[PDB]
Amino acid sequence: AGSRLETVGSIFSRTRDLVRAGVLKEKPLWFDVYDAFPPLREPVFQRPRVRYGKAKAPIQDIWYHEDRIRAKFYSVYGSGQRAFDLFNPNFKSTCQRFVEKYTELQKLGETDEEKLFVETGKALLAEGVILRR
Template identity: 65%
Template sequence: MGRLCPFSLGPFSGTRDLLRSRVLAEAQKPLWFDVYAAFPPLREPVYQEPRQRYGKVKDVIPPILYQEDEIRATFYEAFGNGPKAFELSRLNFKSTSQRFVEKFNELQKEGKIEPEKLFEETGKQLLAEGIILRRKGTANVARQTREEAKTRDLVLEMNLQNILEERQEQKQDQEEEHLESTDAKKENPLS
């Protein structure tokens, strides 16, 4: 109702009217009401939107994106968050991505490495310092190779079982033939 009326009702007059009509009980009266009634301001504080002199002025907020944000984004894209959580309780804690960004900037300032190879070289430098970075997809690749190896092993095992069964059948056939021939020799010793 406040925006539709040509005159604006402030919080004091609205609260006063609610108390008079007994919609608000005395126990629900706000703390500031008695102070405001005892010491009223010279003019009632009413917020009015200032008139726009020059039409609609849009507030242009430039995008805030630093170079290190781009480096960090490529780092997280390649390596992910990593296995450890951030230790925010330690004041001097530096995340792996922060160390990567610092080393990247350091190598970039030296200027000895080509910009295309700078990302890989930074990873190698951190590895030399003892920080192990694992690419996002390597665990999946390792899992896939393990699964492929399992299926390959199953196929080999099945082939070996088939070969062994065939050999056993051949041996049994040979033994049966040998037994039959020895039985035949026993029956006919002259032949």
């Protein structure tokens, strides 16, 4: 039977070494499958560390441009009385309609945020969606 030193190397390295040294008479059933199709990372034990000083996690926050627009919306018109349906993969909120109209007005016109906001509100009201400030 193989070595039980789970913190030394990986199962593959231990099994390979013991097979080479003659301790194991025959390779285990999984050895050939592993050897032909190895994992992306060799499963070696490692002790997780606490970070200190200036060391910071490299995970970035996910932001998109329209978030700014969304923020303004949720502060001015508030949360839409219509409820979200997250089960629908193509659900479209009032805020999303506002975002799409804002982007269209930006791409077919000038770049002044306040004017874009009021023009988008006017266009949505013309469409016939209620937007209480």
